Ligand binder design. Structure first.
Ligand SMILES: Nc1cnc(-c2cc(N)nc3[nH]ccc23)cn1
Length: 272
């Protein structure tokens, strides 16, 4: 990772919190192409000082995202590890993450919008699958909206997949259980089972989010009941707009080896 000095970063408003992290809007002062000076809007993702012992996994997450370059993967600009800070500096995405956007625009997101976003996410995951690169935390909170749909010019929405954060292979068990049903059953059994099939399950859960208007699946269940949901081999209810429900359930297969390739997922989406 490129090293960015603290002096070149300005922290502005808080945008929220993640697992052992806090996120801010900020500005990066930099020399850009042709030697021009720029003040660039950035997302600043800060590891909590109390959780400094996760710094390797925290940065390994971003390192994953920058191993490869792709139009549907968030851009990491660098890191700031001056002083006692562990900061990831990322591109600033004006419209934020899809969990919020789906709730706020629930009245005007239709089947075609959801299909286009699902296709784009499946394209990103196919690229990761072809490169045998595990993401490990696919969810609507980690999908960023670069561009809104503009029917007046035909333009579809455009999304990117953000970094997974600290890996489920190192997080406390209680956090993994709270993350059912994004974390697949085999990873609740043994977080070391994380592998490419993990991301097919979580893609199903994310498609359920995209079809459910801001709702979080199983949010009414406490952690014990989420565990028992897996023990009883239940599936998520179909979204009211159920066009993708069979794909959701085929991806959320309790047998990891039976989950379909992202090539097959893409062919299924193109059939609709
Ligand atoms: N790479 C990223 C990631 N998230 C945002 C973002 C934008 C916004 N308008 N509100 C937000 N609220 C929380 C996060 C966020 C921006 N850029």
């Amino acid at each position: 990772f490129h090293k960015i000095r603290n002096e070149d970063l300005i922290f502005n408003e808080s945008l929220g919190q993640g697992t052992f992290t806090k996120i801010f809007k900020g500005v990066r002062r930099e020399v850009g192409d042709y030697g021009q000076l720029h003040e660039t809007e950035v997302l600043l993702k800060v590891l909590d000082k109390a959780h400094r012992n996760y710094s390797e996994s925290f940065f390994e997450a971003a390192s994953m995202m920058s191993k490869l370059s792709h139009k549907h993967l968030v851009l990491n600009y660098g890191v700031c590890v001056c002083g006692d800070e562990n900061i990831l500096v990322q591109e600033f995405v004006k419209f934020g993450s899809l969990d919020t956007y789906l709730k706020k625009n629930k009245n005007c997101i239709n089947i075609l919008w959801k299909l286009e976003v699902a296709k784009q996410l499946a394209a990103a995951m196919h690229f990761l699958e072809e490169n045998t690169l595990i993401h490990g935390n696919v969810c609507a909170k980690n999908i960023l909206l670069i561009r809104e749909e503009d029917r007046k010019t035909g333009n579809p929405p455009f999304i990117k997949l953000s970094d997974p954060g600290i890996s489920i292979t190192v997080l406390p068990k209680d956090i993994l259980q709270e993350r059912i049903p994004w974390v697949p059953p085999e990873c609740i059994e043994n977080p070391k089972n994380l592998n490419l099939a993990t991301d097919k399950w979580s893609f199903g859960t994310t498609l359920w989010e995209i079809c459910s208007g801001g709702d979080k699946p199983l949010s009414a269940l406490d952690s014990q009941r989420k565990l028992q949901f897996y023990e009883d081999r239940h599936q998520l209810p179909a979204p009211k707009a159920a066009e993708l429900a069979n794909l959701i359930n085929n991806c959320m297969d309790y047998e990891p080896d039976h989950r379909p390739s992202f090539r097959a997922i893409i062919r299924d989406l193109n059939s609709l």
